[PDB]
């Protein structure tokens, strides 16, 4: 049974009352506890730095060269806070209401309020660390609107806010490392989780440079391994982002909360052939001019600018005319994917649609268009090779973010006692749709102001030490990992790892992608095990275990993705409603929005691994709304 452990009383004092009620660890005793932190993103680095400042022995891990390589670094948009510096009507309650309504009423209210309440402290801490936020001429901070939000509550660096936030967190982590409190282990990836007597007591890692398999033991384990949006082969996530850690934890007993909840991005640079899997994120501030079109003829060799106005299929205009071409990204991207799927694409392989700017150039002044889109146009010209000022842009949707993940209660603790999941790896509080500039805020909130208290409470309830790395559980986990690696290396089939990953990604994008139906999901669930068996029988990963073998890492990540895809397809088939990112074609209003069902699906679904990949158990955590009412 899932106990959310949410406090009681008025929602404004819930976090303070909980903070008072939780237990504490004396500052002298903090040195007797060891905490393992797997991940060094915004959440991971912030958590490691704060727990090192407290006094605990922290063991931080990351699979990249340095802790400062992580898709927290790539974020372009700003970060939200309820400071109300622009005197426009923003507040903590307004932010809480916005976040709980933007999620389509699929998240707990207490978590959302806590996030909105600690956002202000997040901004204060980030400024105090030397983060170069944009300033006004008088020396005070500057705010901007996130392209549609009703208030200007966003703080930003020029175009790399995520980089500056992660660099502040990384500098704090480096300061702790120099103090001897935090031990950093880059270029090693956690391969398994070891639970001793029902508590997550350690991890089994592989050092990707030398191939060494190492066993670490600790009182508490924190997972900050980011999202799993890379299960689709084409996505805007980094080339190394994966779901190995969370899947291993889920297999160990953690509950997966709404794995089917995914968020996509409307405008991304299309692929240039069947060898690329990374789609570069553009800015949402485009599409303001609209002018999304495609040639009426299926195949035209003429230049895009040579096509007359009467010969252009300006779809999204004769369809959904009431919105004003500013249709929601879900509907626009579904229409674009359908158009490209019909065979009427414009890209190299036929994937992409035209985003024209010529009418905007003529109507407006080129000076202002340059002053608002110069970085984007230069970046597009650098990658694509075509000037947007003359030729139309090409865009294609891609999977961007995952709201789903491991279920956690109010204390950020998963089903397994002692296992804490923060950042993008937990279901947390975005609900069915992630608002802009909210993942950074959520990660920093979890790292800085939330996790220390709850982990201190859990550690105070127990006693330090008692578990070493010679227990039979460690040996069994290590033997399983070694057998898995040896089998992977000994399969030596024909098809490569990327072929299997691409096949899985295309199947997941066509069936469990933007638009989902029962027949398609059933077909995908039928198809997944055949692909998994073909992978486990006919894969070719060359090299040796004790070297720098990248194909082995890719093979492991692909195996975990093949296992996770079945669960997320099952979850998508289960939820017979449309809400947020999750869209079902049988439950849409005629306009094209998501038609919810609040009297039968107003809960959080947690899936339990029962040993069978086709029959996982479903547990429902009901949601009750008291301050914000569904409508």
């Amino acid at each position: 049974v899932l106990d959310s452990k949410v406090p009681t009383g008025p929602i404004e004092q819930r976090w303070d009352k909980h903070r008072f009620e939780m237990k504490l660890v004396n500052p002298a005793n903090r040195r007797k506890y060891t905490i393992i932190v797997v991940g060094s993103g915004l959440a991971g680095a912030s958590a490691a730095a704060t727990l090192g400042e407290a006094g605990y022995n922290v063991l931080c891990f990351c699979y990249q060269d340095s802790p400062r390589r992580a898709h927290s670094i790539a974020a372009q948009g700003g970060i939200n806070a309820a400071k109300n510096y622009r005197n426009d009507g923003d507040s903590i309650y307004r932010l809480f209401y916005d976040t709980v309504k933007g999620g389509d009423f699929r998240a707990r209210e207490s978590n959302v309020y806590r996030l909105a309440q600690v956002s202000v402290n997040i901004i204060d801490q980030c400024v105090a660390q030397g983060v170069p936020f944009a300033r006004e001429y008088g020396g005070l901070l500057d705010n901007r609107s996130f392209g549609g939000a009703q208030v200007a509550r966003t703080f930003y660096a020029r175009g790399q806010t995520g980089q500056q936030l992660l660099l502040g967190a990384y500098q704090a982590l480096s300061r702790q490392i120099a103090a001897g409190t935090v031990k950093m282990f880059p270029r090693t990836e956690m391969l398994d989780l070891v639970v001793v007597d029902g508590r997550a007591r350690g991890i089994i890692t592989r050092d990707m440079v030398t191939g060494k398999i190492t066993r670490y033991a600790a009182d508490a384990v924190v997972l900050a391994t980011g999202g799993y949006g890379n299960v689709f082969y084409l996505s805007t996530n980094a080339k190394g982002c994966n779901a190995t850690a969370i899947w291993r934890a889920h297999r160990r007993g953690a509950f997966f909360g709404n794995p089917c909840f995914t968020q996509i991005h409307p405008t991304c640079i299309p692929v240039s052939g069947e060898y690329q899997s990374k789609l570069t994120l553009m800015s949402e501030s485009l599409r303001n001019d609209g002018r999304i079109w495609v040639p009426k003829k299926k195949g035209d060799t003429r230049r895009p600018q040579d096509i007359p106005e009467s010969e252009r299929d300006y779809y999204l205009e004769e369809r959904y005319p009431s919105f004003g071409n500013l249709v929601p990204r879900d509907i626009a991207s579904r229409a674009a994917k359908q158009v490209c799927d019909e065979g009427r694409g414009v890209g190299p392989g036929g994937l992409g649609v035209y985003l024209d700017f010529a009418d905007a150039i003529k109507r407006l002044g080129r000076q202002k268009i340059a002053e608002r889109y110069g970085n984007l146009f230069d970046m597009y010209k650098q990658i694509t090779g075509e000037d947007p000022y003359e030729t139309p842009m090409r865009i294609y949707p891609a999977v961007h973010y995952t709201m789903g993940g491991l279920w956690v209660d109010y204390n950020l603790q998963s089903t397994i006692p002692g296992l804490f999941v923060i950042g993008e790896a937990n279901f947390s509080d975005h609900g069915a749709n992630r608002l802009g500039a909210s993942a950074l805020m959520q990660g920093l909130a979890d790292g800085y102001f939330i996790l220390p208290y709850t982990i201190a409470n859990f550690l105070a309830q127990v006693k330090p030490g008692g578990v070493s790395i010679d227990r039979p559980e460690f040996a069994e986990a290590e033997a399983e990992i070694n057998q898995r690696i040896q089998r992977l290396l000994s399969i030596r089939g024909k098809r490569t790892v990327d072929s299997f990953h691409r096949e899985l990604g295309k199947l997941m994008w066509d069936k469990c992608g933007m638009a989902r139906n029962a027949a398609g999901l059933r077909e995908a669930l039928q198809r997944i095990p055949e692909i998994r068996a073909e992978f486990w029988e006919n894969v070719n990963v060359p090299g040796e275990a004790n070297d720098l073998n990248q194909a082995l890492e890719k093979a492991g990540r692909v195996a975990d993705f093949l296992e996770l895809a079945e669960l997320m397809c099952l979850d998508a088939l289960h939820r017979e409603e449309s809400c947020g990112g999750h869209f079902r074609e049988e439950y849409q209003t005629p306009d094209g929005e998501a038609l919810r069902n609040d009297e039968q699906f107003s809960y959080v679904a947690a899936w339990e691994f029962t040993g069978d990949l086709a029959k996982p158990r479903l547990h429902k955590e009901p949601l009750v709304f008291e301050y914000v009412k569904p409508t």
Partner: protein, 257 residues
């Protein structure tokens, strides 16, 4: 577009390496360099050889993990871009392209094109931060920062830690990286209370780590992906002179674990 490549191939840190040639017939002009390397790796795996290993995470020129010396110039012939941002439209049919990792004593080579850049991490660990603990921060708008100072601090702070400055510098010096961090932290009021110590510590760490000296050649600023100007080095020199006038002694060096 037929392309011949000469890739450095080294088995491990202690095993010596050598150049090997690979000829590929069809190369899409609009695909990036790293994707061409990926296609080459797939071909090698199909044939039965050991694939080429290189660092890559984001493929957007922000993370700073890309590190390649292409045709003698860091990050490829085009300037102000990283290796992940370089596309094959900048090359010519029948060209010969030489691919190498960075070369420095402080950047040991671990594989064919992968190097160990933990020296930058250790340089950061020795004072490259602001010592403020969580929860003690004052309100955001307490200390005013002029727009010009914030803009220059952001210009210096956009360093992706790629290590191309070390590779381009004839002396193998990390002066541009250290200067950029020092300039970032020294242009804001929050970095005032410990700047004169900070620079000294950081400089000492670089000397401890195995980097060379700066002859003001200026080669680093020509290949820097984020166009860090040479005025950061002047700012570092001013800070170090002023710290020496104050009798600031460097602390103990950060020894690797």
């Amino acid at each position: 577009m037929k392309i011949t490549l000469k890739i450095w191939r080294q088995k491990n840190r202690n095993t010596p390496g050598e150049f090997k040639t690979y000829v590929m017939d069809n190369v899409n002009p609009d695909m990036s360099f790293l994707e061409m390397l990926d296609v080459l790796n797939e071909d090698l795996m199909s044939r039965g050889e050991e694939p080429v290993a290189f660092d890559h995470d984001c493929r957007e020129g922000i993370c700073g993990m890309c590190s390649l010396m292409i045709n003698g110039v860091a990050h490829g012939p085009k300037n102000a871009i990283t290796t992940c941002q370089l596309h094959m439209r900048s090359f010519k049919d029948g060209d010969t392209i030489t691919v190498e990792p960075w070369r420095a004593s402080a950047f040991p080579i671990l594989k064919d094109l992968v190097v160990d850049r933990s020296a930058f991490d250790r340089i950061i660990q020795a004072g490259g931060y602001i010592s403020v603990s969580t929860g003690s921060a004052p309100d955001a708008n307490t200390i005013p920062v002029s727009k010009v100072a914030a803009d220059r601090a952001m210009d210096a702070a956009a360093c992706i830690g790629c290590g191309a400055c070390v590779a381009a510098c004839p002396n193998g010096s990390a002066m541009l990286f250290t200067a950029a961090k020092v300039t970032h932290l020294a242009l804001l009021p929050q970095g005032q209370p410990e700047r004169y110590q900070r620079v000294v510590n950081m400089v000492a760490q670089a000397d401890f780590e195995g980097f060379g000296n700066c002859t003001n050649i200026g080669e680093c600023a020509a290949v820097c992906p984020k166009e860090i100007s040479l005025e950061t080095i002047a700012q570092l020199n001013r800070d170090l002179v002023m710290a020496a006038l104050r009798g600031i002694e460097p602390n103990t060096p950060i020894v690797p674990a």
